[PDB]
Design a protein around this ligand. Structure first.
Ligand SMILES: Nc1ncnc2c1ncn2[C@@H]1O[C@H](COP(=O)(O)OP(=O)(O)O)[C@@H](O)[C@H]1O
Ligand SMILES: Nc1ncnc2c1ncn2[C@@H]1O[C@H](COP(=O)(O)OP(=O)(O)O)[C@@H](O)[C@H]1O
Ligand SMILES: [Mg+2]
Ligand SMILES: [Mg+2]
Ligand SMILES: [Mg+2]
Lengths: 99, 264, 264, 99
């Protein structure tokens, strides 16, 4: 009956936690605040995301890269199985996306 | 819904001859469905019925629960945007390169930001292995390489249903093997629903989750690949195995041979 | 002669690009020879070289020991009568029935008596299983049924060499299985020499006595069917088995992926 | 070097013996004398034929039938293996050609 989508993000110390659906219709608020949301961070937690489309994964890669440009290596924690299937389809190397 | 397309007692007639005698067919969403049958049965016709370009005489064709023939012209126009009939004409703009082709749909019909759109096309070009051909033109593209770029642009907007009309014809086993793995890869990753019409029976059954065989204006037999290739039925076995003689006779009915050789 | 057609160091060039780099190929008479390779290599070109419609830049094409390019126009015209390139145009007269089509060659170019000519066409119509369609027209003929009538008229004069240019394309396995058995039957009975170009690798190797694989303007590998399908060579194995990736890369050379995703 | 073709036939009592090549270029003299060469006969001897084309086999079928119309059943003796292969290709029944 109800199929609403949202995307939220909370930074706790050095870890950024995304939760909700990470897809095309809701990712704009995060991209506009991309540089402010990831630059205190050294680990992105997709632990609490339920859906990831191709555009949302592209946003994730840019978020990972923005933290790499700061100079601190970043961890990927809690990634869903389907996201890795999508990454394997796009042959995403270890640079853009840690496994 | 469990079935993205659901045909219910569908009959279609052209001129004096009947093509379909209330057929009822199912395409479960997220899975690969294969349509097979002799040339001239109405496979292309059956696809255009799902698309709405032609309407049945009787029956109903429910896409995502919604009956296509009864749709408004405003509604059918919008519902068709969730579909993609591949290897048609149009396919690729001939005046822009490969990257601009696959990017063109998102550049207009989505309000995704620009740097993410750019990364999205790069990924989808890697999906069909044409990231190095991003600056090439369709003029320079190979035979199979062109059709892979069409597939890339088709999944650019990520439609719900993709239909392939004999996509393997005139292709060497390397070109064909690439397109078979590609279709199976995009189905198991993006979850796109695929309908594949083909005569290459062994290749299509290797990736299909459900198959259908048509003959004599009706559905001869359906089922899974393992269920079909173990089905012991002469008219099903003759088609799946490609045997010269069976319920489809090799010999046209002729009458007495001795008289035709030695008359008067 | 042991080889009806014998190509010796044959090179052919169109415009700026070279198609053949002194190829040397063999067709032994009385046996079925198969030509395979990716689309655009020059398979149809190689056939027209044997026929004489085009001449090589260098080399010699010896049909029955006689070099075709060096033949007189009077001699090439007569030598070509021993050949038949099948599933061309012309094939069947559209204004006379099936019997009259297959009978037309013998009615003029042979001085066989009439009652024996009549029995001869009846037998050859039974060979392709169309004796019951003797009074039908090409208007009414099915897809596969029409091509079987062309085959019947082709063997009416019993030529020495028959060439098939991708004869199985767009055909269901029943229609294809009939034409495969037909070709193999006419070869083992009349002893006609057959050259078959095709992409349907498993079907053509089942009846071929010798096969050839072409790539990069040259012959990759030849040999018998059992010798080829047991040949462990990556570029031979990738083609015969239809593997997506191999010496023919699935991925176009692209460069650094990370930079294409994340620029500035 | 020499590849000449001929067709001969000799009737000995009740048996007709063909010898030579039974093909398109040499069969006319026999067809013009078909009714005179087979009507004292009740057995055709392809024992001594080396080559049989499709037209020559058609002549053989008519020769067999002409003797059938007289009322005496006829034998086929000494037929080469390749001739039967040709008959199997044309699905020739037991009426037109005994085995
Ligand atoms: N405009 C038309 N008028 C009459 N008959 C038609 C028309 N269009 C198609 N047909 C017939 O209906 C059948 C439709 O076949 P088609 O949809 O092309 O199936 P397939 O692609 O499997 O051959 C064909 O046999 C054709 O002869
Ligand atoms: N008139 C022409 N001018 C320039 N190039 C040509 C011409 N005709 C053919 N070619 C090229 O030569 C090759 C001949 O291929 P073809 O004989 O059709 O082989 P196949 O039938 O195996 O594709 C093709 O790649 C084609 O691009
Ligand atoms: Mg079709
Ligand atoms: Mg060709
Ligand atoms: Mg095949």
């Amino acid at each position: 009956y109800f199929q609403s989508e949202s995307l939220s993000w909370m930074q706790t110390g050095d870890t950024l936690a995304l939760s909700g659906e990470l897809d095309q219709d809701v990712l704009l608020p995060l991209w506009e605040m991309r540089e402010e949301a990831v630059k205190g961070i050294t680990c992105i937690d997709l632990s609490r995301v339920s859906r990831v489309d191709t555009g949302g994964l592209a946003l994730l890669l840019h978020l990972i890269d923005l933290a790499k440009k700061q100079g601190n290596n970043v961890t990927l924690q809690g990634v869903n199985d389907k996201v890795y299937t999508l990454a394997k389809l796009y042959n995403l190397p270890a640079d853009v996306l840690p496994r | 819904v469990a079935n993205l397309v659901d045909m219910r007692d569908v009959s279609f007639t052209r001129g004096n001859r009947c093509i379909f005698d209330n057929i009822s067919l199912t395409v479960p969403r997220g899975k690969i469905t294969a349509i097979m049958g002799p040339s001239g049965i109405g496979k292309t016709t059956l696809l255009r019925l799902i698309g709405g370009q032609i309407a049945p005489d009787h029956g109903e064709i429910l896409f995502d629960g919604e009956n296509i023939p009864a749709m408004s012209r405003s509604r059918l126009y919008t519902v068709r945007k969730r579909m993609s009939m591949l290897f048609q004409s149009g396919a690729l703009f001939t005046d822009m390169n490969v990257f601009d082709n696959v990017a063109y749909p998102l550049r207009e019909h989505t309000q995704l930001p620009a740097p993410l759109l750019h990364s999205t096309v790069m990924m989808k070009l890697e999906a069909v292995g044409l990231r190095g051909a991003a600056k090439l033109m369709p003029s320079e593209l190979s035979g199979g390489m062109a059709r892979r770029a069409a597939l890339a642009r088709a999944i650019a907007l990520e439609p719900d249903l993709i239909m392939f009309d004999e996509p393997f014809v005139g292709q060497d086993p390397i070109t064909m093997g690439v397109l078979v793995k590609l279709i199976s890869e995009l189905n198991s990753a993006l979850g796109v629903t695929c309908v594949v019409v083909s005569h290459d029976v062994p290749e299509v059954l290797s990736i299909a989750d459900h198959a259908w065989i048509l003959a004599d204006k009706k559905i001869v037999a359906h089922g899974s690949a393992q269920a079909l290739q173990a089905n012991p039925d002469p008219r099903v076995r003759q088609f799946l195995d490609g045997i010269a003689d069976g319920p489809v006779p090799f010999r046209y009915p002729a009458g007495d041979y001795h008289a035709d050789l030695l008359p008067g």
